[PDB]
Amino acid sequence: MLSVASRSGPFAPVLSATSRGVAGALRPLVQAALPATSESPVLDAKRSFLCRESLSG
Amino acid sequence: MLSVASRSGPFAPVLSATSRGVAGALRPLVQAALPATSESPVLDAKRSFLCRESLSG
Amino acid sequence: PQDLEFTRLPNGLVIASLENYAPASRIGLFIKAGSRYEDSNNLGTSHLLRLASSLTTKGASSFKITRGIEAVGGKLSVTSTRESMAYTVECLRDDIEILMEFLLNVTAAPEFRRWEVAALQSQLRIDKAVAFQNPQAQVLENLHAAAYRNALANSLYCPDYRIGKVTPDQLHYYVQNHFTSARMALIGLGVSHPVLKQVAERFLNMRGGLGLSGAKAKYRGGEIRDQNGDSLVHAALVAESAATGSAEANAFSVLQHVLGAGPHVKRGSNATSSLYQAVAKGVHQPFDVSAFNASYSDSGLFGIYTISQAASAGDVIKSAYDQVKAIAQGNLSNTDVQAAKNKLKAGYLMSVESSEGFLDEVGSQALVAGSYMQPSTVLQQIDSVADADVINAAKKFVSGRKSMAASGNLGHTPFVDE
Amino acid sequence: PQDLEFTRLPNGLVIASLENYAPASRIGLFIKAGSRYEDSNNLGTSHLLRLASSLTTKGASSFKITRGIEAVGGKLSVTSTRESMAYTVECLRDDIEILMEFLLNVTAAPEFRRWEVAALQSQLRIDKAVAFQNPQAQVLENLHAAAYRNALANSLYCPDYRIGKVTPDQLHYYVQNHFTSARMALIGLGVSHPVLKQVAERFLNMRGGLGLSGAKAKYRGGEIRDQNGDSLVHAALVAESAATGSAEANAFSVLQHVLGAGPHVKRGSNATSSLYQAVAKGVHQPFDVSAFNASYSDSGLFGIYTISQAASAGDVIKSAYDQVKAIAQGNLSNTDVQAAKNKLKAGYLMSVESSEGFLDEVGSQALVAGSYMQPSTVLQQIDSVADADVINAAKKFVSGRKSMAASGNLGHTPFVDE
User: Fold this and answer.
1) How many Å apart are CA A9 and CA A25, to the nearest integer?
2) How far D267 CA lies from chain C's nearest CA (Å)?
3) How far apart, in whole angstroms, are the C-alpha atoms of residue D322 and residue D341?
4) C125: nearest CA partner in chain A
5) How far apart are the first and last CA of chain D?
6) Member of which family (chains A, B) (predicted)?
7) Which of D69, D130, D263 comes nearest B17 by C-beta?
8) What is the C-alpha to C-alpha distance for residues A19 and A31, in angstroms, rounded to an integer?
9) At D415, phi and psi to the nearest 5?
């Protein structure tokens, strides 16, 4: 009936024309981050993650 | 009792001081070469295969 | 008001439109394509097709597409799953007619010129390395290859040997056989229903029917282990469950929220998650645990996902699997079933609030079922799930053949037969 | 004459010497080390140890080892299996005393200086990429990882994530725990027996016993598939057989030569190979097929190896496996058994002709069994194999749990459960 995002877990990539590429829905699922020392590393092809997609205007 | 090279099939690498590196014993096993078009490709880190190890002197 | 207007065309195309009185508009074209429809000779063609939406078409050059959309402030994005692709356009209400014309040139008449396709091959390497900075992404691609022999085991990203070798003739052949009118749906959000229809009668000259049947997916009970230098161990353990749009699929959705499907309170201790409480009894170190649910058109997967440290990974997986065994032998309260139905009901209504989530929800219903259902109907199907069906869905997992994928320092991670 | 002089030292060291009257000499030190003795935290330490024989020791700098060996025309080489390492020195008869001193500094007192070990890390990448130009090499490393859970699944080459991160403290710890006198044998070929002994009493101050017991290898019935862009498909299919030095190991050696273990005539059609004749009945395209035999100290593998084209790979594997099933149900002539005993007898005597093959043969017998046996004894053990034991070794393969590894275009290659 429904999407793959409703019954959450299988992932999806996006490409934009003026925005950044996103991977998945529940891949950074949390309370692995409240348990200590979950570091996102420095990258060599690094990206902006908030990526204008939630901007105030 | 015996070696792994007597009951042939498990492979071995070598390193020398003045000779080339060799891999295995029966890895280039043949009559795949009498059946047609078995090409050894051009390499980017290419080596000498006869590698002085059978020289006449 | 004006809930939805739903219409089948005589060539098989689905058109749906809801008239808002919102200052913005949204158009989406949804296609039955993606990585499950490629075979062993053209692996990675649908990843390159996703990255090629700005290239030269027959109606507009690549300069005019970039400049013409940016001149009014609009956007163009492509999103893909293993079973579908979606092309989305958004702008303000008075600019929507000229961005609808750009969307039809991209999907119904592309050119794949040699020098433009050759310059785009290096973008496959950049796009894959960005996505693989998340350890969840490569674990989930190994899990589909371990679970299936074909047709759902294909990755969303191009294989490494294949970068540089996707040809223009392969891109022309993929669009010709998979972008057809009986596999497509056009969804609008701020446009009237007569405007979308005469838009839709400008791509029917070619693409008249169904293009190519895909192979049915066959379950493999495999296992893939990937030793590397990451600091934490990611592992997943699944079994085959049920296809989307069945009565057994609703019982697995309720079972996921009984066990635990993500947190509700910021920095909370997950007090209602029965999986999280059972692991945290014996483990006194940082971890995470979740229930996994993936549902497709002819198959599905259900299981557990753990993130742990290397020396503690065997203790986390064994205690998580033992909690599912207690539900399968009858230990289930009706208070915990009713609390799980509330999280499943509230999460469905919250995922349809925005324009982005509402448009994706109508598009999936149009391709899978070919109709639209009100959310009042969806909320009554969740109410009809009984306590006997939740126990019976946990028995299908316990007695089923397993698949596994793990990554990290795997010196204490158990094998799938142990 | 002067066949061999065999001697145990009170610290456990084995010394063997044969006095030739040949102008050249050969010294070899054989050690129970190699990749089966490393764990998940120091993977690749024994590959870097193999490449480090020219580095600075306590008795000679790295300049004096290269210049001092080249000044007399000598050689220094290291060879490794999964279960052993061997250090070999060769020169003319009058130069052998000063090259014996260089060999003892390399193995009994190395220094692993920081800047020399750091400059050697990039040689791991060059050495692995040279070896992997042969498609047989990576197929056979995937096959050991598919067949075992530990302790024979480790690769001969360093993993890619680990290149750059092998430390000097790991190299010091590996030599301290695995290069000990009760795990070592010293074999000479043109030197007298009193000369090797006082050489041997200059490495006993440390390394007095057994260093570390390795884990017993546990069989896994796994499968690893590697899709790439090679033009031919390489596949292997094995089961667990027998350890070296048993009566059942001799029956698997005879069974290998019944089926076919390589060609005897240049550009010949392999008329006596029952595997090659059964495949070539239905396949009319280029292929190759062989019987595989790998025997270790506590386990062994036996099976088939095929090289084929992509569209024909399923037909080659199924017809090769059916021929082994006919032998297991009793179809075996005594004419074919006697012809197979002749190829096994003649191949053993031809592999011991040169000085290189004779020195390796004495070194393996000293580590595995701790004694030397004449080739007349070896030829009588092959004669005692009966026809009932060849049929019983083919029944262990047919009813045993399988392992598989394949590479190439795998769109027509069967799965191990099919």
Assistant:
1) 7
2) 33
3) 23
4) A45
5) 57
6) Belongs to the Rieske iron-sulfur protein family.
7) D69
8) 28
9) -85, 155
